[PDB]
Structure formats: C-alpha cells, structure tokens
C-alpha cells in the first residue's frame, strides 16, 4: 500500500493474512466473511505464468493480526485449510478475469475485538455505492512502493474511477468483473495498492445502515501509485452467485 499509513487497532477485523508454510512467507491479503470461510484473490494460489500452483497443506491463514511479522499472542488466530475453491472461469492466460477464490477453514474461528467478518453487498447495496468518485478503503501488509515492506498493517482510501477511464489507462483486456480506483494527476492526492496486497479487501461503509461491505478484492495493477494508473480490484458483487453457490456447496 503506497501513500497509506498505519492502521488503528481493530480497525479492520476481517483482515486475514495468507501465509506460505515453507519458506514461511506472507503471500497475500484475504478477508473473513464468516466463522468458517475466507475470501482471497485466485492468483494468490494459481498463477502458472510464475509457476504458482499452491494447495491446502501448502498454506495457512492468520486472522486478527496487525504486526506484519511477530506472533501476536492471544490476539491472532491461525487456521489451516480444508478446501481451496477457485472460480472455474478464472482467467490467468489473459487478464485475471474473475480473480477470486475461497478457502474453508479446518476449524471455524471465534470472533473477538480483532476478528470479525465483513458484509457482502446486495444488488441494492452494490447498485448505490459502487459508483465513480465515491471512496472505499484498501488495507494490506503489501509493499510500500514498487522499488521496503511495512511493520504493521497499512490503510488507504481511494476514489473509484469511471469504467471508461480504467479502459483508457491500460492495455490489458478489462472486463465487467473488475473495477479500478485511485486518483488522477489533477487531484493532487495519491494512493495505491501494491504487490503483496492481493486478496485483501476494498471495503465501503454504508451510510444507510453503518456497516462495512466488501466491494472489491485486490487483484492487479501496473507498478504501484503510478501517475495515471489505477488499482484493479475484482468486482465482488458480480461474482456473489458463485460465492453463494460454493458456500451452500
């Protein structure tokens, strides 16, 4: 997360840390959506172009954390994975279309002050908030610039961008399952996500009912905080039916 800052304790209790078992290594962000389910970006798990094809026993999940590295005792909860579920139409050949994935936990976690799930949006909720110029919030332990990594969780707030403008800001074949967000050079503000932030949530607060809903998953970009480039987040709502189907199973 570039041009962000330290996150206030318990300010993102759905934040999940995706963690490689050997070498022990933070891989990606993720999000808690229930006691027994976690949402991350598919490419955190499956990306043939970089030889990545992790499976369940390759990984673990760390919930309720704040420090990037140390074992925050009786705060964080660690879970192994029963199942990984990747979107069957997930596209790693071209554009990361439907970069979305679910992990079911071997044992459901207990909610606490540092551990709580996020809401998923309705038609209604997505219809009204996922609109250009409106702001959301990206959080992660990912890198702080493109060319080093932060000690505690980072937060930044970014405006959504007009679908056309995303299309004109890149070469990659954009789709309806993606939205871009970030500032423009006129506006004289900054901010973006980065390598390592994948899987983490782009969330929005509802002014109607005061809850946080997860509208995006950090999917991709081109460098980090680059002038006239925008972060790309998987469009969560658009893929809600897949989600819903997998959970009911």
């Amino acid at each position: 997360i570039v041009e962000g800052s330290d996150a206030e304790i318990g300010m993102s209790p759905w934040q999940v840390m995706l963690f490689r078992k050997s070498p022990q290594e933070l891989l990606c962000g993720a999000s808690l959506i229930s006691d027994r389910w976690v949402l991350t970006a598919a490419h955190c798990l499956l990306y043939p172009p970089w030889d990545k094809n992790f499976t369940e026993n390759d990984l673990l999940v760390r919930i309720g954390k704040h420090s990037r590295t140390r074992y925050e005792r009786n705060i964080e909860k660690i879970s192994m994975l029963e199942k990984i579920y990747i979107h069957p139409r997930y596209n790693w050949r071209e554009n990361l279309d439907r970069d979305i994935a679910l992990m079911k936990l071997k044992k459901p976690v207990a909610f606490s002050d540092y551990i709580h799930p996020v809401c998923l949006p309705d038609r209604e909720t997505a219809a009204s908030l996922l609109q250009a110029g409106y702001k959301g919030r990206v959080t992660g332990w990912g890198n702080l610039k493109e060319t080093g990594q932060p000690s505690v969780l980072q937060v930044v707030n970014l405006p959504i961008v007009e679908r056309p403008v995303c299309k004109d800001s890149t070469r990659i074949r954009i789709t309806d399952n993606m939205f871009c967000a970030g500032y423009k050079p006129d506006e004289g503000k900054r901010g973006d996500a980065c390598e390592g932030d994948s899987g983490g949530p782009f969330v929005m607060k509802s002014p109607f009912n005061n809850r946080w809903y997860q509208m995006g998953i950090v999917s991709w970009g081109e460098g980090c905080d680059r002038d006239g480039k925008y972060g790309f987040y998987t469009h969560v709502f658009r893929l809600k039916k897949w989600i819903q189907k997998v959970i009911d199973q």
Partner: peptide, 28 residues
Amino acid sequence: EADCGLRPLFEKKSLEDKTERELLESYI
C-alpha cells in the same frame, strides 16, 4: 454474518476510525 460489518472497537463502541469520514463525505 448476522452481525457483519460492525467493528467491536468502533461501531460497537460508537467511535470513528480516523479516516472513515473521508469516505462518507465522498458521497456527494
């Protein structure tokens, strides 16, 4: 899930994190 999106240390104790009003304001 029944109690989603309400953070123990903020919504529940009736506190604002220090950038959430950034977000709300953006709704014009």
